Amino acid sequence: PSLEDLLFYTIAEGQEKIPVHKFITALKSTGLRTSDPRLKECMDMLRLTLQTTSDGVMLDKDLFKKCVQSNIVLLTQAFRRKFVIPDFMSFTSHIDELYESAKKQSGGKVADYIPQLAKFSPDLWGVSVCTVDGQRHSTGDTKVPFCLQSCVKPLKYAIAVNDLGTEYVHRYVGKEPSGLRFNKLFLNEDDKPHNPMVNAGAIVVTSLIKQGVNNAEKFDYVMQFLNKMAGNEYVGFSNATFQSERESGDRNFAIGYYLKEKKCFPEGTDMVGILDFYFQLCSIEVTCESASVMAATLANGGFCPITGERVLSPEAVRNTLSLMHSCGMYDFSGQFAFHVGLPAKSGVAGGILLVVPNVMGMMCWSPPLDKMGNSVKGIHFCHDLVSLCNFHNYDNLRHFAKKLDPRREG
Amino acid sequence: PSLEDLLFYTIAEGQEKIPVHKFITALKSTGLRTSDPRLKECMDMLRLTLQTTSDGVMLDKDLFKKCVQSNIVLLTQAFRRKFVIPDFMSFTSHIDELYESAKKQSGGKVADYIPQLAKFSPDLWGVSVCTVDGQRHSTGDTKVPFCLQSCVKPLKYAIAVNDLGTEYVHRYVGKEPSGLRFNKLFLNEDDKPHNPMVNAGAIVVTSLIKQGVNNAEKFDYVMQFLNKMAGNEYVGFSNATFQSERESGDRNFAIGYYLKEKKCFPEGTDMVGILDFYFQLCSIEVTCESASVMAATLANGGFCPITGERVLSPEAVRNTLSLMHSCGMYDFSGQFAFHVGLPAKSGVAGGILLVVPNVMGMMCWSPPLDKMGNSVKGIHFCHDLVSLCNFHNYDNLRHFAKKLDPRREG
Amino acid sequence: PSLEDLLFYTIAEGQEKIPVHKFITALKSTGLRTSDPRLKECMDMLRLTLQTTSDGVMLDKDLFKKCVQSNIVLLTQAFRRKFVIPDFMSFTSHIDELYESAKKQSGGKVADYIPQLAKFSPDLWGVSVCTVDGQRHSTGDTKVPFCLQSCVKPLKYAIAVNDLGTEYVHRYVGKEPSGLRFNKLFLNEDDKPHNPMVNAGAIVVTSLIKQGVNNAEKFDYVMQFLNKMAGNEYVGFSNATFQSERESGDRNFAIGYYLKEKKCFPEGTDMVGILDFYFQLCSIEVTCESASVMAATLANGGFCPITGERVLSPEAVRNTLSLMHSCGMYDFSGQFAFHVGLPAKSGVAGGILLVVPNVMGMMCWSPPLDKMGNSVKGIHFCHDLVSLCNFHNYDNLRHFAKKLDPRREG
Amino acid sequence: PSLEDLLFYTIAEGQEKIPVHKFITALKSTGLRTSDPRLKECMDMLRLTLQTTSDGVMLDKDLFKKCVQSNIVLLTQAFRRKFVIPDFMSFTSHIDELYESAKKQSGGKVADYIPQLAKFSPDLWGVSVCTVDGQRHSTGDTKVPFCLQSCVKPLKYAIAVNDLGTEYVHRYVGKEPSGLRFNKLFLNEDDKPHNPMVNAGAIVVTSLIKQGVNNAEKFDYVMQFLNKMAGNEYVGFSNATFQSERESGDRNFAIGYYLKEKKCFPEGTDMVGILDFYFQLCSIEVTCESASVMAATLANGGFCPITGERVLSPEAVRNTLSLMHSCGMYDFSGQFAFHVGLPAKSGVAGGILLVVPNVMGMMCWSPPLDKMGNSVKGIHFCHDLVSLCNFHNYDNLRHFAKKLDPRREG
Ligand SMILES: O=C(Cc1ccccc1)Nc1nnc(O[C@H]2CCN(c3nnc(NC(=O)Cc4ccccc4)s3)C2)s1
Ligand SMILES: O=C(Cc1ccccc1)Nc1nnc(O[C@H]2CCN(c3nnc(NC(=O)Cc4ccccc4)s3)C2)s1
């Protein structure tokens, strides 16, 4: 027997003749994109053999094999419906329905406390799925860059725990939701910020990453770390957003001075520089598609699903997912934990970094915020998503009433 | 072929006649109990068979068919290792190790505020397991009866949501933690108790169950419900605890009057009778074994794993697990959710009702409480349990490092 | 080929038919006693056939088989020189030499402390050995009865740990050595007596054994336990010593009231009654011979060597030996632990209960005590024993210089 | 009859002539390392035989014998499973389990004390095993140098007892534990430090070693002596530790002048110089691996296991193990002797020199210390080790219950 032949005869019409477009169409049907990095050798070989002629354009058993052999394990998985969502084409059809149902929710207000945020049309709206196996789907304005803003707080927290461990990091920042009556003050009883997802805790977390090197290096390191997380999809930087976040961060300066007086930073911290580094991190740019891969790294235990690279240690990913469960949607965190039951993080640009652990990462993005600061359409989509599929964290994987389970072929 | 025979040949192992004990030893090694209520036809037929046969004891292929025919579906899954934890033998060896390790942890003080709690030895330590498939294991003092106390709050909240639905119930009780917060206060900002797991929330929830009947029926209605969740294993009642709980419940009356003044109950509530009913529900008795079956019903989407009976709606089990996650362990809830990441509930008698969704339910019991009111040995065992197994809510099911996964066999 | 004949050929070799006396001389040369309770059925069958037959007195292979059939495993090990000391004859020859050496050491003062057993002769000196296999040897006054006194302290501690557990028992008593130290104090810094071998620790351990019954029952319970350790050899009682210990224990009454005031006993303790139970346990009587079997039981992981019966749990025997190591010999414990490195316990009647783990148990008895309260001859013998043999806890089993190893063969 | 072909017919599947790598894989599975000094002749010969890389590589029986003849006795013992842990592959699998189980106790605090230990990461964690026969295993950061600090106290005590005898050495230092917050006192009743494992006694012991020569020779001579102990594996020296230790030993200078005034040193001692020698000895560097060999020399009666050389007299080793038993772990000595039962010595760098007499030596190393000054992870590992294996000094070798005995076959 032979692994590449057995797959060949499957894609074949039971015949000696596989058009190349047919193989590409059959591959996309699994949800993988031809640009998938773990498929490069195969796609390289297809480019080679499609240069060989122009009156081709078709693969023998051994020429087909000549392309796929380097990537055969991944390709057989895709075609033998081994992926976490076997019938992904039906799943994207539901994601499209949900997208159009949230698209009709044109409420909310675009953040206008800085020009870069207020310029954004209230009509932009995108949703991008990337499963733990790299299957990709997008509806809407998914390639438009926007700033992460607070959506960066879990990513940097995970960096910090990845490099330093849980015990050190939580010498400086708590582990618990603050919660709603006291969503205003800065420090819990132990004089630490309540958790990494509030501004004070985010600011403290910023002060732990790559201590010793300067802010130009530190930002470089976070970018490289973020690139690993997105499988080298789009990550960028809005200097405009940086400058206006910087020129109007009085509450952030208040927090930094308060944390300094309270001795909240590690020894040898330059607080005013950390605020600058914090403003930079908030201005990092992503798209729906590329942020969805970062979310899929978190859904996948710290392995980037479209490169296979270990990016975050599993301690880091669990801690971060834990804190996004209870602290990730501002004052809506408890409501969201209760009704959506998914680790998520929103940001003022309108992003919601959403994680279905073991299944998929998602990024939703619609600039109009509700009065708690969360994207209206993003919040609506998250609710529908879990009304549809047994993705709620305490849904039962066996008895789940009439919710749909996309992990099953039935 | 035929379901009874191919399993018969599975156990026949070369001989034709299967010895009875040999079938029973293979059956128990799956972790099922011969007294499992879903095995009754099979076991009555065995017992009857060993009456009507010489001294046997051996089963022919047709006699084996006669016994196991009624229960053949479950017996196959048990024997084809298709249960949620396939190598249950090895798993219980680990439970035993965890049990022994927490047994060395003294510290804590038995709740002594009432003499019925003060009587229990500090050396009582019991732990019981029941998987979503009915597989069972127990170590230590697991047949000693003790009162649920606060472990009843998630159970009665589940009853309320099952009968009334999420929306009606949470008109009266919020859905968000305290955190470590302050929980001396009674009402959130909507003049609702914060969540069903704090005493004020519990008291209100109690005021919703079976409105209209008297306390004697209300009580029977809840016990009938508990009986089902426990597959009809021990659910008792400690009138000595009840009388002593009501003759020293100043804070609870303080709460009942405050709630009445703030109009937190449904119209037509007799508040002082609701407090009496509340005190009854706290004095309901369980063993580790029987309460572990209650936990498994919540692990199993509302179906009792040892009877197959549906006890709670999926919406009921989901909300309860969400709230045990964030508000179940008193002021340790945030730490517990962070480090253990399992829906759990503690009680002043020393129990920790614990739920590993889709896997198993547990009850750990050791009377000595720590400063926050949680069983010292149970909190310890819970930490070790998740140190060992990738059971943490935000562990990854694929990439989990050196953690052991008992749903795998590799 | 049968074990009975194979063994039969061993002692036959030459003539056929083994004379009974030839069998008996070869049996006792292994160091077993013909009265060994594990050989009773063999010995009854001999005695019977030497009635059944005016013949012989000679055993052919089939008659020898009839006799030794039921005790063949032990008789095999005994004759195949598989006992822990194979050349037992040579070893006892060394015991005798050590015995005669300690005998010329005629110093010390018999405890005048007590009108009774200030009555024993300084010239009484006895030494009894029982190995972990039942091999016995005695030299000197080894059938003279004397009181355990403090030699009972490890035995009742072992009983308490056995019934109650290490963890319950050591809520009431520490585990750390005396030392020259706080020789006079009663309590360590946790307000517990320092360990079970000091009088206040012993008095507390006594208050733990068989709580809830009267002193007559407790005493029978401890004596039945002492009977099993001693393979049912002499365990008696000296009311003469007891009554006299009881009307002259002002120090112990001092300890009992201090312990009561500092809340060291279990709830519901009758301290003055405990003091009388304690006085009773000190007046329990043994011989060297019978007490050597108790030591051997501790040397054998808790199995009585001459009955094969489990008397104490492994946890109980290990704790006891750990505490006899460091607290066993009054203010000589540190010195003794250093120079002898054997778990031992001395009593004021002149006994020293010596345990060579995995080898043998011993009792040495000479009434004259040195200024520290340890038998002058016994301490001398214990020093000579360890200079001769590589029995010191921290001798090496493979590299031991000019020391003799009696587990090895000649 | 032969002996080297016997081994050849064992290593060979009774066929051709044994690939060299197959012999190497067979050897490494006994636990021996190919770098074993006692195997140098055999490995020189394989290195010589395989120098015809022109063509190899099989051992034409006589060619096999050509290599193994010199070291046959040690090679057959290894292959005939005569080593003290026969199934050494299984044992190291348990060591890894124990290692990773301890790896999760991230509690404790690295000695800030001096910058050179404040520079070591709380993530480091290594554990090395060397049995009395040379079988080696390591897990974790076992090649990272760290200072012995007080782990050197038993090694220099043994040297002094080796060179000067027990009577002389204990004219100056005692032989008994002090005994729990007893530790402040520098001197016992006879105005000698209490034992060689406290700083006062260690300082006095240091002043006995190689009197007459200057401190540069003395340090050299202790290095040569430590080189033999480690089988010439890594022994080094940290000058940075040394200078930091000397610029901050006010306590040691306090002890120094106390001993000088109390006339505790040998005549003609230069106390201030001895302090400097002492500081050097504490700054001597080892690795986990090389330290485990030092520990295995003490487990092996003073013979280095991987060289066969007699390094310490048996008097020195037994005295050293006796004093490590009772005095080795600071205020935790008594608790440690009781619950672990192994002679051990800890150091502020985070090391624990662990000895299982007649079985193996070990070094565990993790910088973070508990409040008693003992490595958190190391203490956790020691507890687990004795909870698994019957290595407790007073575990019975025959009746040992739940525990694995690695000295035994199947
Ligand atoms: O002592 C000398 C001379 C001397 C010798 C050496 C050192 C100093 C003085 N002459 C006396 N000897 N005994 C005397 O009366 C003793 C009898 C028992 N008793 C106590 N036992 N345990 C105690 N400690 C605690 O209950 C908690 C605790 C323990 C340790 C530290 C703090 C609290 S008190 C008082 S008078
Ligand atoms: O107590 C506290 C309170 C405290 C402080 C911090 C934390 C907790 C508690 N602090 C002190 N600790 N040590 C102090 O002085 C040191 C130096 C002198 N001294 C001695 N060492 N050896 C001696 N010899 C005998 O003792 C013989 C001898 C023994 C028996 C009988 C006669 C003579 S003297 C100890 S001061």
Beta bridge partners of C355: C361
The C-alpha atoms of residue B354 and residue B360 are separated, in whole angstroms, by: 9
Picking from D344, D351, D292, the residue whose alpha carbon sits closest to that of residue D323 is D344
Contacts of B358 in chain A (CB under 8 A): 396-398
Contact B315, B161 (CB under 8 A): yes
The C-alpha atoms of residue A215 and residue A100 are separated, in whole angstroms, by: 42
The C-alpha atoms of residue C310 and residue C316 are separated, in whole angstroms, by: 12
C-alpha torsion sign, points B331, B335, B337, B342: negative
Contact C194, C174 (CB under 8 A): yes
C234-256 as b/e, with b when 16 or more CB fall inside 10 Å?
A: bbebbeebbebbbeebeebeebb
CB C185 less than 6 A from any atom of ligand 1: yes
Nearest CB partner across the interface for D399, out of C303, C325, C400: C303
Contacts of B106 in chain C (CB under 8 A): 167, 171
| Helices B271-282 and B215-229, packing angle to 10 deg | 30
* Residue owning the nearest CA to atom 31 of ligand 1: C189
The tokens for B133 are 């498939």
Rg (CA), chain C: 23
The C-alpha atoms of residue C348 and residue C367 are separated, in whole angstroms, by: 8
Close Cβ partners of C38 (under 8 Å, ≥ 6 residues apart): C71, C74, C134, C306, C307, C308
Q: Which burial class, exposed, middle or buried, applies to B37 when counting CB atoms under 10 A from its CB (0-12, 13-18, 19+)?
A: middle
Q: Which burial class, exposed, middle or buried, applies to C360 when counting CB atoms under 10 A from its CB (0-12, 13-18, 19+)?
A: buried
The C-alpha atoms of residue A322 and residue B222 are separated, in whole angstroms, by: 34
The C-alpha atoms of residue D61 and residue C264 are separated, in whole angstroms, by: 74
Q: Identify whether residues B30 and B58 lie together within a single domain.
A: yes
Q: Identify whether residues A46 and A62 lie together within a single domain.
A: yes
Q: Do A176 and B178 touch (CB under 8 A)?
A: no
The tokens for B179 are 């955190």
The answer, for D103 touching chain A at a CB cutoff of 8 Å, is: no
The C-alpha atoms of residue A327 and residue A323 are separated, in whole angstroms, by: 6
Close Cβ partners of D364 (under 8 Å, ≥ 6 residues apart): D126, D127, D288, D351, D352, D354, D375, D377, D378, D381, D382
Q: Identify whether residues D46 and D101 lie together within a single domain.
A: no
Provide the phi-psi class of C362: left if phi over 0, else alpha when psi is between -120 and 50, else beta. Answer: beta
The answer, for A401 touching chain B at a CB cutoff of 8 Å, is: yes
Contact D336, D343 (CB under 8 A): no
The tokens for A367 are 């600039």
B101, B123, B376: best mutation site toward chain C, by most C Cβ within 10 Å?
Answer: B123
The tokens for D165 are 């005898």
The C-alpha atoms of residue B110 and residue C64 are separated, in whole angstroms, by: 64
Pocket-forming residues, ligand 2, beta carbon under 6 Å: D 184-187, 189
Strands A284-286 and A235-237: antiparallel
Looking at ligand 1, which atom is closest to the CA of residue C262? 26
Q: Is the peptide bond before B386 cis (omega within 30 degrees of 0)?
A: no
Residues 72-91 of C with CB under 8 A from D: none
> DSSP letters along D167-194, please?
HHHTTTS--S---SS-TT-S--TTSS-S
What range does the domain containing A377 cover? 82-410
Nearest CB partner across the interface for D396, out of C177, C300, C398: C300
Picking from C151, C94, C96, C394, the residue whose alpha carbon sits closest to that of residue C292 is C151
Give the Å distances, CA to CA, from A92 to A98, A295, A356. 10, 18, 15
Q: Is C284 helix (H, G, I), strand (E, B) or coil?
A: strand
The C-alpha atoms of residue B71 and residue C338 are separated, in whole angstroms, by: 67
Contacts of C325 in chain D (CB under 8 A): 325, 337, 393-394
The C-alpha atoms of residue C166 and residue C157 are separated, in whole angstroms, by: 10
Looking at ligand 1, which atom is closest to the CA of residue C188? 29
**End-of-domain residue from the set C25, C52, C81:** C81
Q: Identify whether residues C101 and C242 lie together within a single domain.
A: yes
Close Cβ partners of D380 (under 8 Å, ≥ 6 residues apart): D101, D102, D105
Q: Is B109 helix (H, G, I), strand (E, B) or coil?
A: strand
Q: In CATH, what number is assigned to the domain containing residue A22?
A: 1.10.238.210
Picking from D142, D162, D144, D164, the residue whose alpha carbon sits closest to that of residue D154 is D162
The distance from CA C96 to its chain's CA centroid, rounded to whole angstroms, is 19
How does DSSP classify residue A355? E
The tokens for A346 are 């929103």
Position B301: which residue type? G
Measured in angstroms, how far is the CA atom of residue D187 from the centroid of ligand 2?
A: 8
> DSSP letters along D84-135, please?
SSSSHHHHHHHHHHHHHHHTT---SB--TTSHHHHTS-TT--EEEEEETT--
Within 10 A of A145 (CB to CB), how many other CB atoms are there? Answer: 17
Q: In CATH, what number is assigned to the domain containing residue B410?
A: 3.40.710.10
Q: Nearest chain C residue to D391 by CA: give it.
A: C318
Q: Identify whether residues D232 and D289 lie together within a single domain.
A: yes
Picking from D385, D339, D341, the residue whose alpha carbon sits closest to that of residue D362 is D385
Look-up of token digits 């399992």: B342
Q: Do B387 and D100 touch (CB under 8 A)?
A: no
The answer, for C308 touching chain D at a CB cutoff of 8 Å, is: no
Q: Do C171 and B104 touch (CB under 8 A)?
A: no
Resolution (A): 2.5
> Which H or E element spans position B295?
helix B288-299
CB C174 less than 6 A from any atom of ligand 1: no
Within 10 A of A403 (CB to CB), how many other CB atoms are there? Answer: 15
The tokens for C360 are 């043998």
The C-alpha atoms of residue A288 and residue C158 are separated, in whole angstroms, by: 70
Ligand nearest the Cα of residue C188 is 1
Measured in angstroms, how far is the CA atom of residue C331 from the centroid of ligand 1?
A: 16
Instruction: Inspect the structure and tell me whether chains C and D have 3 or more CB pairs less than 8 Å apart.
Output: yes
> DSSP letters along C12-59, please?
HSSSSSEEHHHHHHHHHHTT--TT-TTSHHHHHHHHHHHHH-SS-SEE
Look-up of token digits 């393979």: C231
> DSSP letters along D350-366, please?
SEEEEEETTTEEEEEE-
Beta bridge partners of A29: none
Dihedral pair phi/psi, residue C13, rounded to 5°: 20, 100
Question: How many CB pairs below 8 Å do chains B and D form together?
Answer: 4
**End-of-domain residue from the set D33, D55, D81:** D81
Contact B228, B309 (CB under 8 A): yes
Dihedral pair phi/psi, residue B186, rounded to 5°: -110, -35
Provide the phi-psi class of B139: left if phi over 0, else alpha when psi is between -120 and 50, else beta. Answer: beta
3-state DSSP helix/strand/coil percent for chain A, to nearest 5? 50, 10, 40
Within 10 A of D3 (CB to CB), how many other CB atoms are there? Answer: 13
Residue A172 to chain D, least CA–CA distance (Å): 16
CB C186 less than 6 A from any atom of ligand 1: yes
The C-alpha atoms of residue B176 and residue A335 are separated, in whole angstroms, by: 7
Close Cβ partners of B347 (under 8 Å, ≥ 6 residues apart): B147, B148, B149, B150, B151, B152, B353
Close Cβ partners of C269 (under 8 Å, ≥ 6 residues apart): C207, C211, C260
Picking from A273, A252, A289, the residue whose alpha carbon sits closest to that of residue A126 is A289
Dihedral pair phi/psi, residue A303, rounded to 5°: -105, 130
Instruction: Inspect the structure and tell me whether chains C and A have 3 or more CB pairs less than 8 Å apart.
Output: no
Q: Identify whether residues A34 and A86 lie together within a single domain.
A: no
| A283 belongs to an annotated ligand binding site | no
First to last CA, chain C: 30
Q: Is B317 helix (H, G, I), strand (E, B) or coil?
A: helix
Q: Is C163 helix (H, G, I), strand (E, B) or coil?
A: helix
Contacts of A165 in chain D (CB under 8 A): 106, 122-123
Dihedral pair phi/psi, residue D131, rounded to 5°: -80, 170
> Which H or E element spans position A360?
strand A360-365
Contacts of D301 in chain C (CB under 8 A): 396, 398-400
Q: Is C69 helix (H, G, I), strand (E, B) or coil?
A: coil
Contact C291, C230 (CB under 8 A): yes
CA atoms within 13 A on the CB side of D80: 13
C113-145 as b/e, with b when 16 or more CB fall inside 10 Å?
A: bbebbeebebebbbbbbbbbbbbbbbbbbbebe
Residue D142 to chain A, least CA–CA distance (Å): 21
> DSSP letters along B113-142, please?
SSHHHHTS-TT--EEEEEETT--EEEEES-
Q: Do D107 and A167 touch (CB under 8 A)?
A: yes
Look-up of token digits 């509302």: B302
A38-58 as b/e, with b when 16 or more CB fall inside 10 Å?
A: bbeebbebbeebeeeeeeeeb
Measured in angstroms, how far is the CA atom of residue C180 from the centroid of ligand 1?
A: 13
Q: Identify whether residues D58 and D123 lie together within a single domain.
A: no
Picking from B33, B120, B92, B116, the residue whose alpha carbon sits closest to that of residue B377 is B120
Close Cβ partners of D320 (under 8 Å, ≥ 6 residues apart): D154, D157, D158, D161, D298, D312, D343
Contact A346, A330 (CB under 8 A): yes
Q: Is the peptide bond before A110 cis (omega within 30 degrees of 0)?
A: no
Contacts of C180 in chain D (CB under 8 A): 176, 188-189
The tokens for B191 are 């003049």
| A239 belongs to an annotated ligand binding site | no
Please tell me the total count of domains within chain C. Answer: 2
* Residue owning the nearest CA to atom 17 of ligand 1: C185
Residue D184 to chain A, least CA–CA distance (Å): 32
Picking from B4, B14, B10, B18, the residue whose alpha carbon sits closest to that of residue B58 is B18
> DSSP letters along A215-275, please?
HHHHHHHHHHHHHHHTTT--EEE-HHHHHHHHHT-HHHHHHHHHHHHTT-S-TT--HHHHH
The answer, for D104 touching chain B at a CB cutoff of 8 Å, is: yes
> DSSP letters along C179-222, please?
-STTSS-S--TTSS-S-TTSHHHHHHHHTTTTTTS-HHHHHHHH
Q: Identify whether residues A64 and A90 lie together within a single domain.
A: no
The tokens for A185 are 């003050």
The C-alpha atoms of residue C126 and residue C129 are separated, in whole angstroms, by: 10
Question: How many CB pairs below 8 Å do chains A and D form together?
Answer: 8
Beta bridge partners of B131: B360
Measured in angstroms, how far is the CA atom of residue C185 from the centroid of ligand 1?
A: 4
Q: Is D303 helix (H, G, I), strand (E, B) or coil?
A: strand
Q: Nearest chain A residue to D121 by CA: give it.
A: A164
Q: Identify whether residues B182 and B140 lie together within a single domain.
A: yes
Q: Is A20 helix (H, G, I), strand (E, B) or coil?
A: helix
| A150 belongs to an annotated ligand binding site | yes
**End-of-domain residue from the set C55, C81, C107:** C81
The C-alpha atoms of residue D387 and residue D204 are separated, in whole angstroms, by: 36
For chain B, the farthest-separated pair of C-alpha atoms sits apart, in whole angstroms, at 76
Within 10 A of D308 (CB to CB), how many other CB atoms are there? Answer: 13
**Technique that determined the structure:** X-ray
Measured in angstroms, how far is the CA atom of residue C371 from the centroid of ligand 1?
A: 22
Look-up of token digits 């809340």: C263
Ligand nearest the Cα of residue D180 is 1
Picking from C350, C345, C336, the residue whose alpha carbon sits closest to that of residue C385 is C336
The C-alpha atoms of residue A306 and residue A37 are separated, in whole angstroms, by: 6
Q: Identify whether residues A98 and A133 lie together within a single domain.
A: yes
Close Cβ partners of B55 (under 8 Å, ≥ 6 residues apart): none
Residue list for the binding site of C: 150, 199, 245, 252, 278, 330, 348
| D245 belongs to an annotated ligand binding site | yes
For chain A, the farthest-separated pair of C-alpha atoms sits apart, in whole angstroms, at 76
Position B151: which residue type? C
Contact C357, C209 (CB under 8 A): no
> Which H or E element spans position D146?
strand D146-147
Q: Is the peptide bond before D348 cis (omega within 30 degrees of 0)?
A: no
D106-138 as b/e, with b when 16 or more CB fall inside 10 Å?
A: bebebbebbebbeebebbbbbbbbbbbbbbbbb
Position D146: which residue type? F
CB C112 less than 6 A from any atom of ligand 1: no
Picking from D214, D211, D212, D235, the residue whose alpha carbon sits closest to that of residue D155 is D235
CA quadruple B134, B138, B141, B147: dihedral, nearest 10? -30
Contact C318, D394 (CB under 8 A): yes
The tokens for A343 are 């680790």
Q: Identify whether residues B97 and B183 lie together within a single domain.
A: yes
- Strand order of the sheet with strand C126-131? C136-140, C126-131, C360-365, C351-356, C344-346
Rg (CA), chain A: 23
Position A264: which residue type? C
Within 10 A of C286 (CB to CB), how many other CB atoms are there? Answer: 30
Q: Nearest chain C residue to B100 by CA: give it.
A: C167
How does DSSP classify residue D212? T
Q: Identify whether residues A97 and A130 lie together within a single domain.
A: yes
